[PDB]
């Protein structure tokens, strides 16, 4: 079987669904492992480096997945109507695994069913304890929060740590993280390292001692209505305005006094909440960041624009898009890891059968042999 | 007596020779303080916080300065050839204190001492303990040298730490300081910090323990090869040296991810520590921090002021790396600023009388009430 790896296409994409080292396990595992030249180059990983590893190189995207069996990306494959057809490039009855954006891209859904092709959306995989080193939402996650911390270091005009020398004094930067899910608890670490005094807010109770174990201030605002704010997936639930008006009084404290804010709450199936409206904005400090994670799905804060440095009130409102491809040298081979690991239970002694009553190719199937799976 | 500090305006430049607490400090000695307005923009300190303090506010950078009898500015004031004739607007016989780039500048020294200003290059203070709070090259560098590894970590395409994940392993970025003065100093800290791991080279061996001491490692080339100079400084090896330094530090360079070179040499453009053949066998990806790139740079590829992408690796070179860090970079400026004054000033009869015996005041002042008084700068008009 031949599974293969085409060049990121997307505005912006620097990752890549391979590395070497995973290179080596397919081989291993009886595979013919197909990357199109230059594949790697956002993410450091060479032509020569995959060859060496066992892989072949094609030259175009049409010849790696010519006659790929399996094709392994990132994100979603483009249409017809976005100028580029991927879909068509992949072999009928072929098998897919990315970040389709499933349950908000149907149009690619149903180009893959016109193809009959299998496509296995990684976005969805079920929140169960041994999928967690398949899943590509905590590992590119984790990478956006260290990431969001060096970006607002980047921007902002005082060095993180406290210091002390023979001129004087210069106090420690103030940094509050908004939601510590994955992102917000790397964020916390980067930003504790590096010097700040760290503060931090969630709605979920489990929260408070992952926050506190890191060294960072936890912010309470309802005590026992954090008690019900988790799901069983491990997601906040809706709070409402009673609640929201109740945040922002305990927030606002710290706020104004914060120098760094990063926001990373998503809810969903929703819209991000609002974390930090613009009236909040104009009590914070002239030289203030906030780097907004959730602005694609909305953002936490009104002013975020998606791709681009917004100032406002003295404060600069960062909303990059696709924040794990700014660390895509380390993200590729996590996501690489991710598939691999998702794939690797599936070969026997030697063929790929995908086990369909497994949980984790049930749960994330959302196309095969024509039909519509989870709609 | 007066003090009046102006907006800077060269180019780039977002630092300011104030900070409100310092302001309160002038006040307390008897002097009345004036800021130009809006001269604390770029490094967040508002007109309102300097007026909180006791500070006057000055419509203009002319309006500033007339009365002054003392004036702190951050880089050489402009002159009638730069464009904007700046040391004409400070009062004849006033006092002024800033990095006057002196040694490489005689136009400047000419156009103060036509106006019989009295002149203190900051950048000349001794290199003597009691004078470390007053140093602007350390506090000033000090930040550079934390600047370099935001500055590395930002162009990077991997974190700086291990990251473990339910997804694998991530390793650490691997960092390679050249040069262990002030700057290189605080990059191994804060390299460190990120959890990198760190390597450091340096032509002076007391450096070894100082490197050992943040955790990082030491490259060693020629352990017996009377380094430092009489006032702490390195210098000029010989090509003999170079070679051999080449040699050692290739091994680490070549799994380098991060190098930040920081060396310089009094008087000298700065010492070549990472050819173009040396940058060719790097990883695609890598980062070069040059921070001496306003001396020559480490690198032959730096270019002030860019960013130089060559053979997969992205050279930095930005010029006033100190203003990348201006809102920090401001008060400790201004504080040494305060700590070289503070010592001459007499409050009950409001004079400045700089005590010509004092160290600081005989190693700073290029000239004096219409002559000439550093060694160097006597000369004829242009
Ligand atoms: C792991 O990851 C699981 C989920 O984390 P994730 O990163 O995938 O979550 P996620 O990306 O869906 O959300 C990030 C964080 O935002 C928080 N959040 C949502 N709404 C919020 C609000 N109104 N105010 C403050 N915080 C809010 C969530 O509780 C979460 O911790 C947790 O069980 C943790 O144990
Ligand atoms: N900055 C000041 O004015 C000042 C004031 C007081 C004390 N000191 C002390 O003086 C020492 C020098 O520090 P600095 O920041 O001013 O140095 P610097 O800026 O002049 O040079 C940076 C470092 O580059 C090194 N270097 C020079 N040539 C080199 C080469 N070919 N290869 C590798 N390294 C090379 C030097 O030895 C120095 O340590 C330190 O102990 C500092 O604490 C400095």
Request: with cysteine.
């Amino acid at each position: 079987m031949k599974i293969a790896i085409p060049k990121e296409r997307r505005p912006g994409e620097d990752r890549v669904a391979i590395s070497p080292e995973v290179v080596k396990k397919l081989v291993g595992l009886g595979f013919e492992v197909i990357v199109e030249q230059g594949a790697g180059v956002g993410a450091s990983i060479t032509d020569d480096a995959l060859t060496a590893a066992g892989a072949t190189i094609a030259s175009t995207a049409a010849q790696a997945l010519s006659q790929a069996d399996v094709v392994w990306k990132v994100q979603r494959p483009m249409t017809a109507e976005e100028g580029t057809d991927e879909v068509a490039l992949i072999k009928e009855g072929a098998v897919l695994m990315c970040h389709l954006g499933a349950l908000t891209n149907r149009p690619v859904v149903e180009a893959l069913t016109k193809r009959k092709i299998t496509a296995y959306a990684m976005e969805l995989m079920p929140r169960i304890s041994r999928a967690q080193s398949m899943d590509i939402l905590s590992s590119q996650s984790n990478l956006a929060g260290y990431r969001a911390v060096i970006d607002g270091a980047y921007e902002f005009a005082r060095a993180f740590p406290m210091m002390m020398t023979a001129a004087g004094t210069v106090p420690p930067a103030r940094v509050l993280v908004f939601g510590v899910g994955v992102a917000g608890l790397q964020a916390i670490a980067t930003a504790k390292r590096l010097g700040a005094v760290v503060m931090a807010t969630d709605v979920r109770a489990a929260t408070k001692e992952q926050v506190e174990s890191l060294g960072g201030k936890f912010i309470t605002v309802d005590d026992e209505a954090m008690k019900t704010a988790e799901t069983a997936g491990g997601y906040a639930k809706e709070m409402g305005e009673e609640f929201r008006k109740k945040q922002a009084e305990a927030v606002l404290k710290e706020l104004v006094k914060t120098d760094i804010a990063i926001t990373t709450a998503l809810i969903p199936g929703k819209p991000a909440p609002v974390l930090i409206t613009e009236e909040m904005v104009t009590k914070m400090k002239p030289g203030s960041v906030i780097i907004d994670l959730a602005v694609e799905a909305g953002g936490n804060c009104p002013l975020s624009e998606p791709g681009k440095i917004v100032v406002k009130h003295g404060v600069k409102i960062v909303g990059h898009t696709n924040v794990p491809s700014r660390v895509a040298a380390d993200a590729s081979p996590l996501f690489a890891k991710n598939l691999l690991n998702f794939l690797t239970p599936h070969v026997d002694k030697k063929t790929l059968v995908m086990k369909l009553e497994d949980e984790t190719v049930s749960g994330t199937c959302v196309t095969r042999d024509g039909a519509i799976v989870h709609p």
